[PDB]
């Protein structure tokens, strides 16, 4: 219904739509048989042998094209049948494009965009440009000239080089001045590209394996897109390119990417063009449209036709959507234009078409082609107008299956790629050498490509202009505004001479990239680690895979990132009934070795990446995980991009004296214009991020897929080397199809790949989030700062004019500029895969910290990557059980200084922010501590800033700026008390602030004290956060501190609550002080249901029993403290039974022995379980005389569910069934200790304190009672 006739090549000439036609040519060309498939659109099913007069032969060029894949068939398209296939093929493809809403649009657009008139050396007059026509030869011999938009030719020598070619002029650049000219697309539906995807495994799990073929519809659309631009005369000059660095060993030898092509592809490639450049173009073509309007206006005469000047004028009014007034004066509506231009450049995109054809397609021009296939789309049993290759109701409608070249293998014949495997390369060596193929190298854009005016001041007026992403919804809205008839006519025109004279539009000029290119290097590079993995490749019987390369220098040059365990397991040595055998087992090993997994931003880590590609960074051996936690994703990147946001250009507002309305309109215009700003700066960052960072990650991603392939093949080889030596004989006895084997491992490889995708997904985002975005957010937060000043000085100054609404306006300005607008990636990316990784990364309040101080692999560091430097004092003490626990002494050299990065901190950052840390504060002991306040965390520059301090039973938060003027919150707690929740126990502090509100202080996630800070400030952002005991007048004093954090926002009740449980480690049991409960460490036992008793044994042996007696004493120091004695009673030791866990920390659900210390002899806690009744009376038995008595306890810190709990010890019989939790019986006599199943029942239904709630108290200098 787009192409109304079914043509057969052999159909005879008629001179209307089947005719021999001449074409614009350098000198004489004899004519060719063309078919006019649609009004304005012609097809010449003939190898383009005539448009470029300097391509004589269809033979491969003597020095080859720098193009990853290329194909040469000088016989192709030489017979009739071939042509007739061609004709039908292109036809069908048009119908395929036309069938989609977007295709209907692009296609109409084309037909409609008539090449301008044009030529006329005289102002007043219009003339047609001769090269924009053809001569159509009738049967009888006369010829008639025809106007023409679009010709499809068969291809030139390089068969797959599909181009858009025009004819030129001496003066005019017809494709870049709004004029347009006739497009000649070299094309073929008889071949298509083979590429590899490795991203669709996270949605379609059982996906192909090898290559997938590009749908020829997409390509044809692609070329039409280019045709479109050029017909409207809006193609970007191709001297305008995206220039790459090229000197580094890893950088891509060379590569031309034309801005035009970027825009054209669409999607995320298009996003490499910064805004300042996108606008330049648009303004430029708008102007080039204006000039057309005005030429129109000047024209008073028309030549070379029987048509009407006005008819023709109106042809163009319609093309360029010009606006006509009453007089006939034309002009360009900025608004109307803006849209057309958006549709030609932002809606007609390869990417959008792929949303429409719903096929699998490459995702960035950067996904290099890999091979070439011959296809035949004309038979319906092969490929239909609606489904393309992925035929509905078959095997192929599934996971882009139609497009898998393996799966649909009767539909793609593989071909010779004429570009050799190392036609273009660089040579990388060591102080051995390899060729690495140019196209396997890293793309590294020049900084030159990224411009902006972020630095430009702006004057806000009341006038000032307020703007006002590409969804399928939106396109619909475009489609519907489309008017889909009144198709520009075919009109009769005065004949042009028999031979139209014209040269093709002369391109650059682009030079031959220098060809490897020697590089002598110090490490093995990741290209080298990658060649090791290849072979070989290869018959007799090599393949003995081995780690520690030199592998290279063989074969069996075949390195693997696997363990001896596997390298040993395949370098035997096995027949023959044991092969069957072998195999299975090697499907398991592979799937454990490759499905391997393992911080809070990079949840999922792939350990074996380091060893695969020697990442990279590549100091060894492979504890890659460690290094990745330490430094960030930044270890993956091969080059580290520069993030260069300049000081944002400030606003300044126009005052409109004695006028209310224009003064408020200027404020509102100001505020909104700000909002644009954050978008402006963000977007830029995304653009920078996409091009220099995400690209490197996508290549490693490509490279990890490739190793996994290498490994699979190396295995396959070695299973087949063996198999081949055999029966065989039988041989015809153990039938075994490597298609099943290949079958399994690709499934397998796929399963690993969803992991690695995830992993590197988190990598890219996290990089953007914590080392790109921030450098920008500072600059914004500053621009914000100064606009506020500027706006409030505006209100004060115009205050009489504003009389009635000043407050209403200070509140406006003060709320909008105090809020940190939210980075939404969804606003800058279209991509489901990333958007959902980012959605996952925000969900977690800690990835958003600006300071996050963890001990990792032997250094205290900042996992948030803000902190510039961390100086650790000479006598800072790390707790060797849990190094995150820092001890600070009242030495001036027990101090940790954190110094933040300069261009990341901004003055107004402690105005809405928060801090958390766990502290452990020893009992105050001495009179001088009664009145002595001492700083411990200091953030103050010259009297201004914030600080945390301590005093006798107090934690103190203090704010102060800039010359006044403190506020202050307090947690207060007593030392005269039996058992303290707080004295010398780990407590979790959280401080929140809000410039227009109050400092709040929270203890273990309970709000304590709050006070108004709105009086101020403002505050002075200190570069320095110093952890030190400053001013403590207790020589012997010290504190413990851990997990320090800093947040650029005010944490709410539910956030801090969460924060509270995430850092609690609910899985590990804890002693009374809050430390990790450890095995083989004497504890004094405290029963919480009766805390005024301790434990005792009346008698050792089974005649005896344990019991609670009282009282506990007191401890005291006259005036300072008087608490319950804590080191009393008989001692418990948790002795390991089974574990693993190399270590000493008693975890939830650990099964243990409990020993009881009686008079410095260790005894074992046990009971007779068949003692009639529910409560079993526990005793202390001679460790060896226990026998078959019940003595195994489950250590607990949760239940079930996972409600935490203080019932610690569930006791079990030597069969594994519960007996009871250990507690105490009594209202009857004498509080003996029992295992009571009633507890286990009770905990399910309540969390109340019970007779089984124990706490384990170790001796600690911080409590300091004497035993």
């Amino acid at each position, epitope marked *: 219904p787009f192409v109304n006739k079914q043509f057969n090549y052999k159909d005879p000439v008629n001179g209307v739509d089947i005719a021999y036609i001449k074409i614009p040519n350098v000198g004489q060309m004899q004519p060719v048989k063309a078919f006019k498939i649609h009004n304005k659109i012609w097809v010449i099913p003939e190898r383009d042998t005539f448009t470029n007069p300097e391509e004589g032969d269809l033979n491969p060029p003597p020095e080859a094209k720098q193009v990853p894949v290329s194909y040469y068939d000088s016989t192709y398209l030489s017979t009739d049948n071939e042509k007739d296939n061609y004709l039908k093929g292109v036809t069908k493809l048009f119908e395929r494009i036309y069938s989609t809403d977007l295709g209907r649009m692009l296609l109409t657009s084309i037909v409609r965009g008539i090449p301008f008139w044009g030529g006329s050396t005289i102002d007043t007059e219009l003339k047609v440009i001769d090269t924009n026509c053809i001569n159509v030869i009738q049967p009888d011999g006369s010829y008639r000239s025809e106007e023409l938009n679009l010709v499809i030719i068969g291809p030139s020598a390089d068969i797959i080089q599909f181009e858009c070619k025009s004819f030129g002029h001496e003066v005019l650049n017809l494709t870049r001045n709004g004029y347009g000219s006739t497009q000649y697309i070299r094309f073929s539906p008889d071949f298509t590209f083979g590429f590899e995807e490795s991203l669709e495994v996270d949605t379609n799990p059982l996906l192909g394996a090898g290559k997938f073929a590009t749908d020829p519809a997409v390509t044809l659309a692609h070329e039409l897109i280019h045709a479109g631009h050029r017909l409207y005369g809006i193609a970007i000059n191709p001297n305008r390119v995206f220039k790459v660095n090229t000197n580094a060993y890893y950088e891509m030898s060379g590569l031309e990417v034309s801005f035009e092509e970027l825009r054209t592809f669409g999607g995320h490639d298009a996003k490499f063009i910064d805004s300042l450049q996108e606008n330049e173009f648009r303004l430029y073509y708008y102007n080039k449209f204006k000039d057309i309007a005005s030429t129109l206006n000047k024209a008073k005469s028309i030549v070379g036709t029987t048509a009407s000047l006005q008819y023709m004028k109106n042809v163009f009014k319609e093309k360029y959507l010009l606006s006509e007034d009453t007089s006939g004066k034309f002009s360009v509506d900025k608004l109307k234009f803006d849209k057309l231009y958006k549709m030609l450049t932002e809606i007609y995109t390869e990417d959008n078409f792929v949303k429409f054809f719903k096929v699998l397609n490459r995702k960035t021009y950067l996904n290099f082609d890999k091979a070439v296939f011959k296809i035949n789309i004309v038979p319906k049993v092969n490929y239909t107008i609606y489904d393309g290759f992925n035929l509905r109701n078959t095997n192929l409608a599934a996971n882009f299956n139609g497009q898998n070249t393996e799966i649909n293998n009767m539909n793609f014949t593989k071909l010779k790629n004429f570009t050799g495997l190392f036609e273009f390369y660089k040579l990388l060596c060591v102080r051995l050498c390899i060729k690495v193929n140019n196209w396997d190298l890293f793309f590294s854009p020049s900084e030159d490509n990224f411009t902006n005016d972020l630095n430009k001041g702006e004057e806000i007026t009341s006038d000032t202009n307020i703007e006002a992403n590409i969804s399928l919804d939106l396109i619909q809205q475009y489609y519907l505004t489309f008017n889909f008839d009144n198709e520009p006519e075919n009109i009769s025109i005065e004949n042009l001479s028999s031979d139209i004279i014209g040269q093709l539009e002369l391109m650059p000029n682009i030079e031959r990239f220098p060809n490897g290119k020697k590089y002598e290097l110090d490490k093995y590079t990741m290209f080298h680690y990658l060649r090791a993995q290849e072979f070989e490749h290869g018959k007799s019987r090599i393949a003995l895979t081995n780690s520690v390369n030199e592998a290279l220098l063989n074969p069996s040059r075949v390195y693997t990132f696997f363990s001896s365990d596997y390298v040993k397991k395949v370098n035997k040595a096995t027949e023959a009934a044991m092969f069957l055998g072998w195999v299975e087992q090697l499907v398991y090993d592979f799937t454990d070795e490759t499905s391997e997994v393992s911080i809070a931003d990079i949840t999922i880590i792939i350990p074996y990446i380091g060893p695969a590609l020697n990442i990279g960074n590549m100091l060894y051996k492979d504890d890659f995980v460690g290094a990745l936690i330490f430094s960030g994703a930044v270890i993956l990147l091969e080059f580290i991009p520069e993030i260069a946001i300049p000081v944002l250009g400030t606003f300044a507002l126009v005052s409109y004296i004695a006028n209310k309305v224009l003064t408020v309109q200027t404020i509102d215009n100001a505020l909104s214009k700000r909002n644009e700003k954050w978008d402006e700066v963000y977007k830029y960052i995304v653009t920078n991020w996409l091009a220099k960072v995400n690209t490197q990650i996508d290549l490693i991603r490509k490279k990890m897929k490739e190793a996994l392939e290498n490994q699979a093949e190396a295995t396959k080889a070695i299973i087949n080397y063996q198999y081949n030596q055999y029966t065989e004989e039988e041989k015809n006895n153990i039938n075994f199809n490597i298609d099943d084997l290949s079958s399994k491992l690709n499934e397998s490889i796929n399963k690993a790949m969803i992991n690695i995708n995830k992993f590197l997904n988190q990598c890219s985002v996290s990089y953007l989030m914590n080392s790109m975005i921030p450098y920008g957010v500072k600059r914004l937060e500053d621009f914000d700062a100064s606009l506020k000043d500027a706006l409030l000085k505006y209100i004060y100054d115009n205050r009489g004019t504003l009389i009635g609404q000043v407050d209403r306006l200070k509140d406006k300005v003060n709320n909008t500029l105090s809020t940190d607008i939210p980075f939404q990636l969804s606003k800058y990316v279209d991509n489901q895969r990333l958007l959902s990784t980012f959605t996952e990364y925000i969900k977690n309040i800690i990835n958003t910290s600006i300071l996050n101080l963890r001990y990792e692999s032997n250094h205290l560091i900042d996992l948030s990557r803000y902190a510039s430097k961390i100086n650790i004092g*000479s*006598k800072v003490n790390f707790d060797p059980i849990d190094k995150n626990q820092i001890q600070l*002494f*009242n*030495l*001036e*050299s027990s101090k940790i200084e954190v110094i933040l990065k300069n261009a990341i901190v901004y003055n107004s950052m402690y105005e809405n922010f928060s801090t958390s840390f766990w502290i452990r504060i*020893p009992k105050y*002991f*001495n*009179s*001088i501590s009664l009145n002595n306040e001492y700083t411990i965390i200091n953030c103050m520059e010259n009297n201004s800033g914030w600080k945390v301090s301590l005093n006798y039973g107090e934690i103190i938060w203090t704010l102060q700026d800039t010359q006044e003027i403190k506020q202050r919150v307090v947690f207060k707690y007593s030392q005269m008390i039996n058992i303290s929740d707080y004295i010398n126990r780990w407590i979790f502090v959280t401080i929140t602030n809000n410039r227009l509100n109050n400092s709040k202080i929270y203890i273990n996630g309970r709000l304590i004290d709050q006070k108004p800070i709105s009086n101020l400030g403002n505050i002075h952002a200190s570069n320095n956060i110093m952890f030190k005991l400053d*001013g403590c*007048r*207790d*020589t*012997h004093r010290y504190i413990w501190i851990k997990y320090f954090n800093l947040f650029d926002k005010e944490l709410n009740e539910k956030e801090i609550k969460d924060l509270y449980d995430n850092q609690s480690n609910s899985g590990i049991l804890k002693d009374f002080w809050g430390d990790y409960l450890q095995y083989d460490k004497p504890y004094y036992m405290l029963n919480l249901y009766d805390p005024n008793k301790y434990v005792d044994v009346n008698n050792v042996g089974i005649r005896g029993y344990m019991y609670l007696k009282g009282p506990r004493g007191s401890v005291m*120091t*006259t005036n300072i403290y008087l608490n319950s004695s804590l080191y009393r009673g008989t001692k418990f030791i948790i002795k390991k039974y089974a574990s693993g866990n190399k270590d000493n920390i008693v975890r939830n659900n650990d099964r243990v022995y409990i020993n009881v210390v009686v008079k410095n002899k260790e005894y074992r806690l046990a009971t007779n379980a068949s003692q009639a009744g529910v409560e079993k009376i526990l005793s202390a038995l001679e460790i060896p005389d226990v026998g078959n008595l019940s003595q195994v306890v489950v250590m607990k810190s949760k239940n079930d569910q996972g409600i935490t709990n203080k019932c610690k010890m569930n006791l079990q019989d030597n069969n594994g069934n519960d007996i009871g939790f250990i507690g105490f019986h009594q209202f009857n006599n004498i509080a003996k200790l029992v295992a009571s199943n009633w507890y286990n029942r009770q905990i399910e239904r309540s969390s109340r304190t019970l007779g089984c709630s124990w706490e384990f108290i170790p*001796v600690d*200098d*911080g*409590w*300091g*009672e*004497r035993p």
Partner: antibody
Framework: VQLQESGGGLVQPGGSLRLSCAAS????????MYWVRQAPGKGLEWVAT????????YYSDSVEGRFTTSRDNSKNTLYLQMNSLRAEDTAIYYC???????????WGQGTLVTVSS | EIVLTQSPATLSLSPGERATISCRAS??????????MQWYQQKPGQAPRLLIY???NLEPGIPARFSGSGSGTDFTLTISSLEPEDFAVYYC?????????FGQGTKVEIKR
């Protein structure tokens, strides 16, 4: 591994004097330093303690506000500034190192200070 | 001002004897599970010499005859078998809190 406290002499009532204890043989910049005095044939007396970094000082009520201690860490020196002296300031003066957190373990010979008209 | 009362006043004793010296504090001398009681031997004309730190620990290179003990407000320095060379003033010192103080000393006199 010693120290070496000099300065002293016959000084007028009302007069002022500077004592200088020099240190070597151990990382000085780490330890708290103490000043202890002993009148001629009488009890020992604690005069001043100064922290490692030199930012915190303690003085016994007796000489508070009259004496000052300070340190020049980069020179391995300790100092005792001594103003408006009284006859009760007559004593031998000993500087000492305090090994954290145990005792004053190392001591100097001690220079003599004498106040009289 | 923690007063360190030290008794006896003087203490004359023939060699190889037992030499109890009793120190005692008006206020506690204990913080962080440590008694901060030092002991000092001072022969005439020489800088005090440390003997026992934290009430109970013997200083490296000091001999066995000296031994510390006590806790809180009641410490005691014993000389397992006196010498002649252990005629000396002996001093207890609290380092628990400022103002650090010394006792007023105990003069070991030798017999014959």
């Amino acid at each position: 591994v010693q120290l070496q406290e000099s300065g002293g002499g016959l000084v007028q009532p009302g007069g002022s004097l500077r004592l200088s204890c020099a240190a070597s043989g151990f990382t000085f910049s780490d330890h708290y330093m103490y000043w202890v005095r002993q009148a001629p044939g009488k009890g020992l007396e604690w005069v001043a303690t100064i922290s490692d970094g030199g930012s915190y000082t303690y003085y016994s009520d007796s000489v508070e506000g009259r004496f000052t201690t300070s340190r020049d860490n980069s020179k391995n020196t300790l100092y005792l500034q001594m103003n408006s002296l009284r006859a009760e300031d007559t004593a031998i003066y000993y500087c000492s190192r305090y090994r954290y957190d145990d005792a004053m373990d190392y001591w100097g010979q001690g220079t003599l200070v004498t106040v009289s008209s | 001002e923690i007063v360190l009362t030290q008794s006896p006043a003087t203490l004359s004793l023939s060699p190889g004897e037992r030499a109890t010296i009793s120190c005692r504090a008006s206020e506690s001398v204990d913080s962080y599970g440590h008694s901060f009681m030092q002991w000092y031997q001072q022969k005439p004309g020489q800088a005090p010499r440390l003997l026992i730190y934290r009430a109970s620990n013997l200083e490296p290179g000091i001999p066995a005859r000296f031994s510390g003990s006590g806790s809180g407000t009641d410490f005691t320095l014993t000389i397992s078998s006196l010498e002649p060379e252990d005629f000396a003033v002996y001093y207890c010192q609290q380092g628990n809190e400022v103002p650090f103080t010394f006792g007023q000393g105990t003069k070991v006199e030798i017999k014959r």
